[PDB]
Amino acid sequence: MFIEQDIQLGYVPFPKSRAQQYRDEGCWKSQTHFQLLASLKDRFAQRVAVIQDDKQLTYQQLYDYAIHYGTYLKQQGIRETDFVLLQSPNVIEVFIVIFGLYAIGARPVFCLHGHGSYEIENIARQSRAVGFLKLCGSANESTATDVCEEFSKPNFKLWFRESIVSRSSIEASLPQLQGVAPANLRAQSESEDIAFLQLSGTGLPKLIPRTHADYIYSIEKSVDVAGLTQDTKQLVVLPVMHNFCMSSPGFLGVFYVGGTVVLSQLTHPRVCFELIEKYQIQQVSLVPAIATLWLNAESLKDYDLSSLQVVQVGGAKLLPSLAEQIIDTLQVKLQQVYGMAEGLVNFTHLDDSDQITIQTQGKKLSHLDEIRIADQDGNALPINAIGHIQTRGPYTINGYYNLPEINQRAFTQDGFYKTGDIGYLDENLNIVVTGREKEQINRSGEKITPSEIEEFILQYSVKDVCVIGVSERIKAIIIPKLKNIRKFLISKAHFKIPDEIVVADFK
C-alpha cells in the first residue's frame, strides 16, 4: 500500500519476479503481525502466552492490552507507517507495547537494551522515527527523555518520548491506559508492507527492514524445525529485542503454536535453573557464553532440569567440544542456529545425529533460500570449499533501510546479501561457519575495522579494494578501474591509514 512512499524513503523491495514466486510457492502469506495475534487469540484465548514473576498474560489478555495500548498510542498522535524506537529489557509489558504498535500499523525499531544515547540518536535520525518508547526494569533507570537529553544535536521530529516502568502487576506498569477506553482499531497495512526495523550486529548499526509476510514465514519454518507445540514451555534468557530471541524460533514461534513463554530478566545460572524446574521448561535458546556460564555453575547439580529437551545455541562460534559438552551435561538435543537479523537462518534438525549437531549449523529454513559460497572474486564454490557465504531468499533483505551507499557494497550485482561470514556447505548440505571475512586488524595495540577503510578507499578511480593485515600492519589490495592513497585518507583516523598498498584479481 505504502510501498510507494517507503521506496522513496530508503526501502529496497523484493524484485517483482522473486516476490511472485514466494507468493505462488506458499511462502508469503496474507497475515500481518497483528492479524496473526488476533487469530492466536481466536484459537488459544485462555492459554497462558507469557509468564514473568507473579505476572502472566493469556493470549486473550495480550490481545486486549495490545488493543488498549494501541488505542492509547493513537490518542497520543502515533500513526500508521510511523517508526517508533523500542528499547526494553526482558519484561512482560514489552509484549503489550509491541503488538500495540502493530495494532495501529506503527512500525517498531527494535533496539537492544544496552545501546547508549549515542546509538539511539543515530538510529532515530536514520529511521526518521517519531517516537521513542523505553521500557525500564526499575525506576532507577534512565527514562526515554533522559536518553534524548544526551543527543549531540536536537531531534525535533522525535516528539513521542515515553517510558514504562515495569512494576509488580501489569495494571500498575501501564497507568496511562486508565483514562483510555479501548477501541475497532483499523490498520491499513498489508502483510507485504514493512512491519519493523531490526538492527544489524562493529560501529553504528544499520537498519534492517522486514515485512510481515517474510518475517511470519521465517517464524513458521522455525516452528517446524524446532518442533514447537502448544505444550511447549520456553525459557527466554536472551534479550527480547534480538532477532534470535524473537523468531529463531523465539517467543513469536511459541506464540505461533499457543505455547508458554517464561521470561527471565536474568541469565544467572541459579535463577534459570529454578525457572526450568518450576515451569518444566522444555526449550531454551542460548549463545555459547551463556552455555559456558551454565555448564560451569556449581548450582547445576541442585535442580531438576529433566524437562529440558532442546537447547538452541547460536549467535557466535560454538566450539564442537562445547557443543558436545552441552549434549552430555544437560542431556538435551543440541540445535545449532546460524542466523542473521538480515534474513537467512539455518537450523540443525531434531532427527540429526548428535555429530551433525556438534559439527555444523544445519540447513536453511526455506527450500527457496539460496546459499552461495563465493571465492575471493565472487564465483560460486562447490561443496566442502571454504569461501564467503552469500544468500538470498524469501525472508532475506535486499537493502538496508535508507543506506544507499552501504547497499552498493553489501549486496552482489544479482542481489545476494554478503553475510561477511566464511565457511562451507558439507556433503549433506549442512552449513559450517568457520570464521569472518574481514577480522579486525590489531595494529600496535589498536583495533581497526577493515570495511571502515575500504569505504574511504572506494571514494578514490577505485574499482575494488580489500584491506587485510600481515606481519599487525594494514595492507590494501586494490583493483584498478601508496603516498596518494594515504594523502587522500589524511584528507578525510591516522592510526588507520594503510601501511602498504594494486592487483587485478583476488579482489
Ligand X SMILES: Nc1ncnc2c1ncn2[C@@H]1O[C@H](COS(=O)(=O)NC(=O)c2ccccc2O)[C@@H](O)[C@H]1O
Report in angstroms how near the CB of residue 372 gets to ligand X at its nearest: 15
Cβ 70 to ligand X shortest distance, Å: 27
User: Residue 187 interacts with ligand X (CB under 6 A)?
Assistant: no
- Report, in Å, the least distance between residue 201 CB and ligand X: 3
Give me the least distance between CB of 225 and ligand X, in Å please.
Answer: 12
Site for ligand X contains 340 (CB under 6 A): yes
What's the min distance (Å) between Cβ of 200 and ligand X? 6
Cell numbers 551435561 correspond to what residue?
Answer: 329
Minimum distance, C-beta of residue 286 to ligand X, in the bound complex (Å): 10
Comparing CB distances to ligand X, the nearer of 126 and 200 is 200
Cβ at position 128, least distance to ligand X in Å? 22
CA distance 266 to 374: 40
> How crowded is residue 473: how many other Cβ atoms within 10 Å of its Cβ?
13
What is the Cα–Cα distance from 131 to 79, expressed in whole angstroms?
10
CB atoms within 10 A of CB 444: 7
390 is a site residue for ligand X (CB under 6 A): no
Asked if 225 contacts 252 with a C-beta cutoff of 8 angstroms, the reply is no
Q: How far is CA 97 from CA 63, 92, 107, 143, 163, in A?
A: 11, 10, 11, 16, 11
d(CA 315, CA 239): 12
Q: Using the rule CB under 6 A, which residue among 70, 89, 258, 315 binds ligand X? A: 315
- Binding flag, residue 441, ligand X (CB under 6 A): no
Number of C-beta neighbours around residue 49 at 10 A: 26
Alpha-carbon distance of 392 to 366, in angstroms, equals 11
Number of CB atoms found within 10 A of residue 192's CB? 21
For residues 126 and 367, give the distance between their C-alpha atoms in angstroms, rounded to a whole number: 34
Identify which of residues 109 and 148 has a Cβ nearer to ligand X in the complex.
Answer: 109
Which grid cell is 435? 570464521
Is 347 a residue that touches ligand X (CB under 6 A)? no
Alpha-carbon distance of 9 to 2, in angstroms, equals 11
Please, what is the minimum distance in Å from the beta carbon of residue 47 to ligand X?
Answer: 25
- Render 430-446 in DSSP notation, one character per residue: -EEEEEESSPPEEETTE
- CA 118 vs CA 11, 148, 151, 205, 466: distances in Å: 24, 9, 7, 11, 29
Quick one: 32 or 430, whose CB is closer to ligand X?
A: 430
Question: What is the rounded distance in angstroms from the CA atom of residue 202 to the CA atom of residue 455?
Answer: 14
Does 196 bind ligand X (CB under 6 A)? Our answer is no
Q: Is 241 in the site for ligand X (CB under 6 A)?
A: no
Q: Which of 66, 237, 341, 477 binds ligand X (CB under 6 A)?
A: 341
Which of 22, 338, 417, 424 touches ligand X by CB under 6 A? 338
- The H or E element containing residue 148 is helix 144-148
- Contact call for residue 61 and ligand X (CB under 6 A): no
Minimum CB distance to ligand X, residue 173 (Å): 28
The answer to whether 108 contacts ligand X (rule: CB under 6 A) is no
Q: How far apart are CA 433 and CA 58, in angstroms?
A: 39
90 is a site residue for ligand X (CB under 6 A): no
336 binds ligand X (CB under 6 A): yes
Output the residue with the shortest Cβ distance to ligand X.
339
- Nearer to ligand X by C-beta: 43 or 317? 317
Q: What nine digits make up the cell of 505?
A: 584479481
Judged by CB under 6 A, the number of residues near ligand X is 22
Tell whether residue 248 is a contact of ligand X (CB under 6 A): yes
Residue from 34, 63, 160, 244 touching ligand X (CB under 6 A): that is: 244
Work out which of 272, 345, 431, 497 binds ligand X, going by CB under 6 A: 345
Q: What is the nearest approach in angstroms of ligand X to the Cβ of residue 199?
A: 8
Residue 337 interacts with ligand X (CB under 6 A): yes or no: yes
User: Which one of 1-9, 175-183, 337-345, 458-466 is the stretch in contact with ligand X (CB under 6 A)?
Assistant: 337-345
> Using CA of residue 92, residue 98, residue 101, residue 104, what is the dihedral sign?
negative
Binding status of residue 361 toward ligand X by CB under 6 A: yes
DSSP string, 449-495: -HHHHHHHHHT----EEEEEEE--EEEEEEE---HHHHHHHHH--GG
Q: Supply the minimum distance, in Å, between the C-beta of residue 288 and ligand X.
A: 8
Contacts with ligand X, residue ranges (CB under 6 A): 200-201, 243-244, 248, 314-318, 336-341, 345, 361, 419-421, 433
